Amino acid sequence: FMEPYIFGNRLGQDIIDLDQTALNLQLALNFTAHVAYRKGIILFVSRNRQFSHLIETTAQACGEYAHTRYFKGGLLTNAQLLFGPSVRLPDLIIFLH
Amino acid sequence: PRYELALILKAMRRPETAAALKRTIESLMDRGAIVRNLESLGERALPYRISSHSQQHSRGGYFLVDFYAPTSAVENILEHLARDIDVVRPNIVKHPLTQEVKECDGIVPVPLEEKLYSTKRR
Amino acid sequence: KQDDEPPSSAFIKEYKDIIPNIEKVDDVVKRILSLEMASRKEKLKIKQEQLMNKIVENPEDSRTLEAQIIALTVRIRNYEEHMQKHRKDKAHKRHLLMSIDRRKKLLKILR
Amino acid sequence: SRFSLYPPVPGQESSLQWAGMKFEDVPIAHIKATYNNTQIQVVSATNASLARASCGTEGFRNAKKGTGIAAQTAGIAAAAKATGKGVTHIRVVVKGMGPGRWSAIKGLTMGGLEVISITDNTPVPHXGCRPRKARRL
Amino acid sequence: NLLKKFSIRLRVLNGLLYKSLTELLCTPQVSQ
Amino acid sequence: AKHLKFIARTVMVQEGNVEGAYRTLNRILTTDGLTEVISRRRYYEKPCRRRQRESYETCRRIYNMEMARKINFLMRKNRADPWLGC
Amino acid sequence: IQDIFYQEDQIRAKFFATYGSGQKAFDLFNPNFKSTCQRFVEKYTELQNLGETDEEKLFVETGKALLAEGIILRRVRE
Amino acid sequence: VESFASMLRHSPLTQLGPAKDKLVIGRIFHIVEDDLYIDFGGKFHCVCKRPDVDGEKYQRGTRVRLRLLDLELTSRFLGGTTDTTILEADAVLLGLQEIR
Amino acid sequence: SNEDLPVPMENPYKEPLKKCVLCEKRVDYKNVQLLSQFISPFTGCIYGRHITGLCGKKQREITKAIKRAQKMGFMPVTYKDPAYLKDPRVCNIRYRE
Amino acid sequence: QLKEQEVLKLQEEAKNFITRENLEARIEEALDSPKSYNWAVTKEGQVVRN
RNA sequence: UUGUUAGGACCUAAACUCAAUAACGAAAGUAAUUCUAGUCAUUUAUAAUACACGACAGCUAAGACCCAAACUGGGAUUAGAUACCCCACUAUGCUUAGCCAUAAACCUAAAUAAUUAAAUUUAACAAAACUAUUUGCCAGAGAACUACUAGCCAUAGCUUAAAACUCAAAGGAC
């Protein structure tokens, strides 16, 4: 499902068309701004441990939330049990990985 | 066709060996052959003890005779040479030069996936 | 038997038309390239070529039904000679009966 | 300038001599190690019998006749008869793959004979005689 | 496929198994 | 029987180390497969069983070699944790 | 997926086969880095613009031009 | 504004061609004991061992020389529909780069 | 459209396939010196293609030449002739530890 | 052209074929000069004639 | 009798390594070497009441006989084994002429030309799925690889193959 976005194969290494990235990134950044404008909750999520501290530092700088640790089963589908009766779930989840 | 004879002869002195190679090559001609070349490979020790005509042999003279003959003559030639008392072991084969070394690009990798499906499925 | 059997002095099909052009060739060289110093397969390529000329209007074409039928008559007569010596060869006995059946099928389409 | 595992080549000249004897002359110790009995015979290089022994001749019987210690005793016994006859160096041709294959060679060493080489002549047919049927147990 | 694929009588079996395993361990057949 | 005696399957004893010579001769006769041949040739193995075994041995080797390859492909990644604490 | 092969690659392949990689080390952090091979391909192109049609002529002439520049090209068959 | 196609054609990584047995300059960014994580400008970093000679010289930020082998270590194993990647590159550390 | 777009072509940097030691070399039953390089010094047994390193074609060529030589009184069967023990080592086999 | 050359080569080669007239003389030349078909290859695939 | 024999005879039977190979043949089947003969073009699928073949085992006649070996005999075993184990030996495995036509003869996959998308595990396990074409075959289970009929160097056989009867299951994968 990624072959649409691949510019080609440079000697075994797939290259990503940066023109499709620019269009898609424009849409994603615009969407992320309107959600933040409306005071929605944004949660950054990644399991890459090299960038765990960077992503937690980014979320703190933005004013948003980060979950870079082991993700518990039911965190979103069973939030009321895990967090409390009136827990407000995120309005947007950004998957850096 | 073109046949390569491999004639192991009894270890003898040159006078008698030359007589053995004249009698042999004459037989090829008597069977309708056209002898092309005669080569010697030297006297040496046999790889094992060959027993011919009620005598055990440990040393023999190796010779090659390149020749042409009809396909029907190959059988008669070997039959006649087997009755000669100075012939340890005659073997006629098709001449190697008539067969030409094939051309190869290299070793093409065969995948392991296609080696286990063969071994199991059949 | 058949009316025509290639002579032993005939050249093989590769050099059949080349040796005549050469001005002078030795008797030995002619004997090496004759049908005497060739396999039975070579003698059959000469039998087939003779039949194609004597029957087919265009002997250059070998894909016509008449040419394919001629190719199978040479094989059939070859297998019959084989089976006269190898009386218990069951693989070639199958080859003989399958060529006969193939010829009959082609003769039907030709008709 | 190194030792060669490969034996000397018969019909050539070599610098290896044992007790003023060439390789072709050193007597031969024929060990037939079967799964029941281990026999031993020592012969001169002209094929003349000098010593003979086996687990049976030592006095072992039935199952004990086919152990490691039984062949060791047979080797020591073969050495003693050979040592009396005038043998110091032996070429060990060990046929068979039984329990006393090695022990018979160890007994010969303990008995005062010096092994210079170890050959193997276990029969291996190249296609031969149909072996007996597998035992159902 | 491959990944999925991968009294008197006891006296006779006890003695013979011993008689055979001793031979397997007297050579490198199992391992060096 | 017709060949020359003492050339085939013959090792030479170095400095009276008669055990070392024997232990090398066994490694030779085993690497060449004579040991397995002599063992199996004691009783008749029927052609149908011979093919089933040789097929199983081939497939077993291929599986072990690939599993060994994977264990060695990740041999380098087994190192101290660079991102300890995160 | 299209294999990405530019026309310079024909020249670059010959350069690596004849001289290997330039003894100077590639610096992939400099966005405008010019390697020994990239200068070879720039000169090879310049000569080809003049109209030389023989590949052998363009390959040996480019080596001479770089030699004048002072670049150390070793024709390492090993 | 230059197009992406132009950027790729003239990119240093495109000029390198095949990365086997090539020479590149890397930078140490992370050190764990005697293991050096070196960025050579590619997608994945490599991990080398601190050489016995001049070990103290290999500190963070130190530019070094490398001989690339693979840009990514990946291999397909029996019963796998995709390649297994360790998210790492292969290179041989040759030594420090002379500042000059 | 774009001059910088990639051009279809066969891989310039393609690496030549790996040949065997006997690739494009005649294998004759009378060249017992070459034949002896693929048998065992002690038993004389033919080595497999995982030891000789030959391809399928040349492995069969050597096999047919050894058997013909052994059957025609040129080569021994139960060992390697001592006169070829000095020749180079081509087979990946170490009897000594 | 190829077949004409092959015929001409064979005719040139046929000059040196053995016959009843030169049999004894050719036998002695062969005996005087032994031939060797032996040669060996290295791990690099290089012939090593001795 | 045994061991050894770089002693003689014999040429019975079977073909180590190669073979970690996957070739050939319609299937059965086929791998010691050499030589001879030899596989090949029908567009393709589709055939019996015809023709030709058909592992192993078995019969007929004359040979062969190294070894193996139903069976038979002797020795052990056990509360007793016609068993499993040991020894001896036979039909037989081999050859040359005739017959027998049977295997889980199964890759348990009919033979062909497609496609890899139909937002298709379309039960589950096997071997990803599916379409088109032609023939053969199947229609709950036992009765039944049976009875009878017919064909056949077969004569307890082989192929073809029911009914009464009795039940509400039989059967498959997990």
Ligand code: FES
């Ligand atoms: S790789 Fe070419 S013949 Fe072996």
Ligand SMILES: [K+]
């Ligand atoms: K009994």
Ligand SMILES: [Mg+2]
């Ligand atoms: Mg026989």
Ligand SMILES: [Mg+2]
């Ligand atoms: Mg032929």
Ligand SMILES: [Mg+2]
């Ligand atoms: Mg009998």
Ligand SMILES: [Mg+2]
């Ligand atoms: Mg009826």
